[PDB]
Design a binder for this molecule. Sequence first.
Ligand SMILES: NC(=O)C1=CN([C@@H]2O[C@H](COP(=O)(O)OP(=O)(O)OC[C@H]3O[C@@H](n4cnc5c(N)ncnc54)[C@H](O)[C@@H]3O)[C@@H](O)[C@H]2O)C=CC1
Ligand SMILES: NC(=O)C1=CN([C@@H]2O[C@H](COP(=O)(O)OP(=O)(O)OC[C@H]3O[C@@H](n4cnc5c(N)ncnc54)[C@H](O)[C@@H]3O)[C@@H](O)[C@H]2O)C=CC1
Ligand SMILES: NC(=O)c1ccc[n+]([C@@H]2O[C@H](COP(=O)([O-])OP(=O)(O)OC[C@H]3O[C@@H](n4cnc5c(N)ncnc54)[C@H](O)[C@@H]3O)[C@@H](O)[C@H]2O)c1
Ligand SMILES: NC(=O)c1ccc[n+]([C@@H]2O[C@H](COP(=O)([O-])OP(=O)(O)OC[C@H]3O[C@@H](n4cnc5c(N)ncnc54)[C@H](O)[C@@H]3O)[C@@H](O)[C@H]2O)c1
Lengths: 330, 325, 325, 330
Amino acid sequence: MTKRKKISLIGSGMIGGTMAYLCAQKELGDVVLFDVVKNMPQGKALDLSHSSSIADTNVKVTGTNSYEDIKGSDVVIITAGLTKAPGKSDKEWSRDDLLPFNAKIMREVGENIKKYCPNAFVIVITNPLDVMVKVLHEHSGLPKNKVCGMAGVLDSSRFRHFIAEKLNVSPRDVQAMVIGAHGDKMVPLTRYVTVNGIPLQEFIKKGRITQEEIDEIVERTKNAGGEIVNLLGQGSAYFAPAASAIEMAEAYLKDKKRVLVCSCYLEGQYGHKDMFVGVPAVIGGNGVEKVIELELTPEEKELFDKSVEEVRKLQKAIKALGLEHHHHHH
Amino acid sequence: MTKRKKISLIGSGMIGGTMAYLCAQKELGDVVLFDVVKNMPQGKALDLSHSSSIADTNVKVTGTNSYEDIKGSDVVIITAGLTKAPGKSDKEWSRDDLLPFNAKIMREVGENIKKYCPNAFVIVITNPLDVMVKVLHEHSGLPKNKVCGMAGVLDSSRFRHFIAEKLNVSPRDVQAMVIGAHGDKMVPLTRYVTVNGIPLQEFIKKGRITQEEIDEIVERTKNAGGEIVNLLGQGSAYFAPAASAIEMAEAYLKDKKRVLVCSCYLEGQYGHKDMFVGVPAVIGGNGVEKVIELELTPEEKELFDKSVEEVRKLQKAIKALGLEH
Amino acid sequence: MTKRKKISLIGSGMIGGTMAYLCAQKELGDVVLFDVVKNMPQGKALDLSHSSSIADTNVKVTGTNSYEDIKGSDVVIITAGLTKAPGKSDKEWSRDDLLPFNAKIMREVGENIKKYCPNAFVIVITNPLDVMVKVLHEHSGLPKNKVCGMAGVLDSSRFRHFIAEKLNVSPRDVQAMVIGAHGDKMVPLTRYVTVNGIPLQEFIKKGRITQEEIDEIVERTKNAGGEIVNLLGQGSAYFAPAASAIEMAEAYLKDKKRVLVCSCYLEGQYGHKDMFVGVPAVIGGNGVEKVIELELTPEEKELFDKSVEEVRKLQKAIKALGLEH
Amino acid sequence: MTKRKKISLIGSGMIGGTMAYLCAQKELGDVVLFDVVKNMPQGKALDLSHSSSIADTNVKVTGTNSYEDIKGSDVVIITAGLTKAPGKSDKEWSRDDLLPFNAKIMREVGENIKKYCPNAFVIVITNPLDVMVKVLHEHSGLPKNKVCGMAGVLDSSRFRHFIAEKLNVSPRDVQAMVIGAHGDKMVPLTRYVTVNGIPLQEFIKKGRITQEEIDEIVERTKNAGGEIVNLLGQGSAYFAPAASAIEMAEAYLKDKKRVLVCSCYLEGQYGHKDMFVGVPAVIGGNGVEKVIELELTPEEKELFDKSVEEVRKLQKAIKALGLEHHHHHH
Ligand SMILES: NC(=O)C1=CN([C@@H]2O[C@H](COP(=O)(O)OP(=O)(O)OC[C@H]3O[C@@H](n4cnc5c(N)ncnc54)[C@H](O)[C@@H]3O)[C@@H](O)[C@H]2O)C=CC1
Ligand SMILES: NC(=O)C1=CN([C@@H]2O[C@H](COP(=O)(O)OP(=O)(O)OC[C@H]3O[C@@H](n4cnc5c(N)ncnc54)[C@H](O)[C@@H]3O)[C@@H](O)[C@H]2O)C=CC1
Ligand SMILES: NC(=O)c1ccc[n+]([C@@H]2O[C@H](COP(=O)([O-])OP(=O)(O)OC[C@H]3O[C@@H](n4cnc5c(N)ncnc54)[C@H](O)[C@@H]3O)[C@@H](O)[C@H]2O)c1
Ligand SMILES: NC(=O)c1ccc[n+]([C@@H]2O[C@H](COP(=O)([O-])OP(=O)(O)OC[C@H]3O[C@@H](n4cnc5c(N)ncnc54)[C@H](O)[C@@H]3O)[C@@H](O)[C@H]2O)c1
């Protein structure tokens, strides 16, 4: 027969479980919840199985501590890693501090994807996002188009939400993109914000929103992750991160050709190569099918290049870790 | 108790039945299917009721030949009318030719809404759309914000589909608007086409689409209705018209504040007043909450004004039939 | 790349177009609308394509007059055929009278499936359903588990709707099956009707429904198709038939293991073999995965056997037309 | 205008947030997330707002620490309370130990519903469920039909899932009910389990499932909550509890006339009155529109009555708490 789709969630914490719940609600495919922690993914998987019965969906949800259970996955979504570095206050939370904790996890996960599901589409969520996706790509041996990072869909959703709230319109009808690194140097593209294709500038000229208010929204978008960390007190955001990665997964599974901002492998676009960074892309059954090259103004391009320089600085730290290949398997 | 929403579909032909099906699938509210043809709406309502059981939804679908069954409707959607004028060929199909048959029907429907459901949000579909909506409005007594015509969501869906197909991207990510009259002088707004906010011009510059291809798509959008009439051989489009009207209805029922192009009563926007014509609008729980006045270029403004002039010409026929002015 | 599912709809009339609309709303897969009428499926496909843009779904809808476009289909759903026999009144409508017109069409469709998409799961709708499915199966060469007819989900949806309406509960919570032939000798299984597993008998005992009311509902279920034919005046039911077939298709495409009554090839269950007739079945990725043999009472068994005998009589006509045996 | 529906979630912890996410996904109405903990509901509400933008839904999600923000709620769902009593091991987890912690919370919540949204339909989740719903009803002054407890939909979903898994059929097609108290003396109604109306017994007679396997499933259903507590290590189940309460809310909001097992106020049915206990009911726009009286056999009825006696024993403990009315307002 043609089997249900199979989605493995490497990491069964807050984002992992929430993504599994979306998969159950949406009947996307069978789900494997993998974690290093014993019993917990099996417990969440039982709860999620019960929830599938309530939803009248037909979804097997399996919890596991064994990588071999990811064999034959169509999609793999990776959240394995730490959310907050120890000995740091909430207010000084930085994704950058997670780097030395999370890089070695990416190598392990990569080696296991290489062994058990080398044909999967792989979405990395673990921070610091743009360099974690590079480590994973390097150690997994996957095709450049079959690995990407979730960040832009989340950052863009934030930008959209804040603009839509201010204008009092449906967020369906706001288009907004945030490109570059997933961090403080992300680049919300104000000039590209539209309301059903109507430039945001029209609304400014009509006095429905001011430049000052837009500038505030751009900064709120940059700071949104930390805003939620400060309010929650434990961990980080999960409902929107989960939804963002599932939107990407959906695009792959059903070959939708969505235009989504993701951290993608560049091969010369925007003047850069051999790194992953946030750019608009077409996502379909071939994975990252196209990186779209925006006609950025010199000012936007300078912001983007400065963003990329933050990824290059993190990449130097990854190199200073020294990670050998074929550590776990080959 | 708070009751389910009640949606009355005045006209139970192709579009009306298809809209009822969406209401059953989406569990939007109870549905009244009204028509002047005896027994037909009752038959469709039984079929639709069976289909709600299959969908596991909770929807009463009532077919009727009596206007009294529209009492208390939250939303009324009007498709009553002819699709093709008697004695005309398919090749010469024109929405304008429907005018003398359908205008009288709008008057009658309006009179009934006025007594039975004056607080409804009313969506007109019957062609020729922009003048039909004005007849309905005038004879119903409804507030200007509580009546509109479905056209621009359909015309825009065509523009979006054709652009998305050429670019090979999801239509979710194509924004395209068509404003003006729902007819040959509709105005597909090429300058406003975006792919997730990215101007279509960027894709031209990169050679992903040519200006000639866009020009073809613009004309294909204008001609889409008659293309489908000629292909089908019977009637006219209905799957997309139904979905477009239901999108509008959902925006009202759930106070969504959608930005949708609809035929709206103008009160000076674009330099025009006291007609309905297609414009971007915010649709929510107060109906047409705002008409958005685009910063049209002089050339776009001219195209819009020539579109409005087609509505004004049709309105002269309405006045000459004794149906208002 | 793993491609989208491909669903071919052989017949692009009322049911075929409505099923395409569900596929577009539900984003089930790309759709091919095939018909012998030139240009009509192409027109509907354009309309449906526009409607997918409105739905924000990602669905190619292709209309065609060429069987070659069914190549590689995952699912094929067959509605090609007549709905009413020429020269008969509505009051005397009988599915049996369609047999000599529609049987030849099943042969032709089968021959094409055999070369172009022999690995498809095939759902037959064309009437008279139980014998049409057997002609298709025989001339297609498909495995017995890969072909079935849609009938029992529709008949059961009617039984469910009528019971749910009388009890004033959600039809989600009514389980009712109708087995046997899709015709006047269908068998609504009163003893198996439940409300969330609670036997209907409990509601009789409490006076929420009477035996006379149930008896009326049983007959209304049997007569439902012809009731809708008489009300509509044109054609026959389509909203519930479409939804029923799409429910079946979804069970296959997503390996759901739904328990649905379908016309299935019997291999000794109920004491019968080598015919298709309505039985409860588990539908999943291997098609008809299991026929469930109910513990019928002697009286129920007799009703089922008399239903099977109606299929056997129709099959004699099939043999006499030279279409198998 | 006719406003969106308004759903207030009193308690913004694991179940509360998860219910808010379902409301955002399903576009059920605007959501108020109330909690006594400062900042946390506001943080979750931001994350959920972002997720609504991703979902293309039109949902306002507000976090609050003020009861007045529940004014005009159509539905109120209460999870306010403790999940695990202190100083107890996971293996000895009991809903009964939560009683003295949670009763006073119910009085406070009730008094505020009375003041701010007396026309709401109220779904209680806080354990120990059947007596918490009684405390809430007593102190809120709501109509008997406008308050109920979520338990049976969850317990029944579990019974359904386990049966459906064993038979390898869609859980849509399994009907199973668990009635009585939400605890160890719940009563899974084996005789009423059906597969599209086909008695489970047919499947036993055909050898597709054994009585021994059914008996195991009945006990697994009784123990399911504790099973998940043991596996998770922290807190209790949330994905299915949330889904269960939203299914009940949906039934109300859209007047669906669903047949759902809920903890309902009895007025003589089953031989009992003036308590809430799990029974099948029709749920629609009038709330609990009908309690269905099953034709229980004497053996099933004995199990049900013993279940009710557990609720009566908890109720005596509630009485021994002594709670005065008009403590917070009136
Ligand atoms: N974008 C737009 O605004 C579109 C507009 N249309 C128009 O919508 C209208 C309906 O199209 P279809 O549903 O396809 O046509 P249809 O012919 O299938 O149905 C029209 C129904 O109106 C009924 N009707 C006629 N006079 C009536 C009366 N006084 N009251 C109640 N019902 C009455 C008829 O009996 C018939 O069932 C046509 O005028 C057509 O031109 C259609 C497509 C797109
Ligand atoms: N429960 C059931 O099994 C139900 C069965 N039916 C049956 O389904 C069939 C279709 O019903 P509708 O869609 O309402 O009819 P319809 O008349 O609207 O469409 C049938 C289509 O089949 C096409 N067709 C005829 N010969 C063909 C050929 N060789 N190949 C391709 N297409 C061809 C026609 O041109 C037409 O478009 C009828 O036989 C009807 O009795 C209908 C309702 C319920
Ligand atoms: N936009 C973004 O890209 C974005 C947004 C939010 C969170 N994040 C990141 O996502 C990651 C997960 O966040 P969360 O809230 O789900 O965290 P969490 O702490 O709730 O869960 C992470 C899980 O990873 C597991 N884990 C640790 N090591 C592992 C290993 N070697 N293999 C498998 N599992 C392992 C842990 O046991 C834990 O269950 C964090 O790195 C966080 O910074 C990124
Ligand atoms: N089937 C059932 O009925 C069922 C199933 C699961 C959980 N539960 C119960 O649901 C309740 C909630 O579980 P959870 O996992 O969401 O717990 P949780 O600890 O994650 O959240 C409970 C929240 O209640 C808040 N709270 C405490 N006192 C409050 C007050 N006076 N007002 C408002 N908020 C207050 C807390 O601050 C906390 O955020 C528990 O009592 C648990 O036993 C019942």
